[PDB]
Design a protein around this ligand. Sequence first.
Ligand SMILES: CC(=O)N[C@@H](Cc1ccc(P(=O)(O)O)c(P(=O)(O)O)c1)C(=O)N[C@H]1CCCCN(Cc2ccc(-c3ccccc3)cc2)C1=O
Length: 106
Amino acid sequence: SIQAEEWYFGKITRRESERLLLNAENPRGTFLVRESETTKGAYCLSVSDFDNAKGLNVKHYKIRKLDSGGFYITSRTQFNSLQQLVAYYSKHADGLCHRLTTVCPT
Ligand SMILES: CC(=O)N[C@@H](Cc1ccc(P(=O)(O)O)c(P(=O)(O)O)c1)C(=O)N[C@H]1CCCCN(Cc2ccc(-c3ccccc3)cc2)C1=O
């Protein structure tokens, strides 16, 4: 279950996810997963970043879930669960702004 996951923030807006992630103490890759504001059944992976050009900023990645069963950001790379997806992206940056590091503070 995802609702039991400490990184699952459920139904919070994009503005609120940014409010939480834009904390100067959050290092690159701080993250949270929330419901997709407009795609039913889909999720959103909001991640903090930091670079000299943009300074502290947030990126949001849409996570889709098929009825076939897999979860994915890109259809090319699928997982059986949201937890598995999160674990994979905590080890690989791939197309993300940074690998997932730790759960965003409240
Ligand atoms: C308006 C906004 O914030 N849109 C987001 C997507 C988003 C998606 C859904 C929802 P919700 O409605 O449905 O929730 C919200 P929101 O409004 O709630 O905030 C916000 C976005 O466009 N992010 C970018 C993030 C990285 C840059 C590229 N990109 C396309 C892309 C390119 C490469 C990869 C990639 C990643 C990993 C591996 C390989 C490639 C992924 C995406 C994005 O989508």
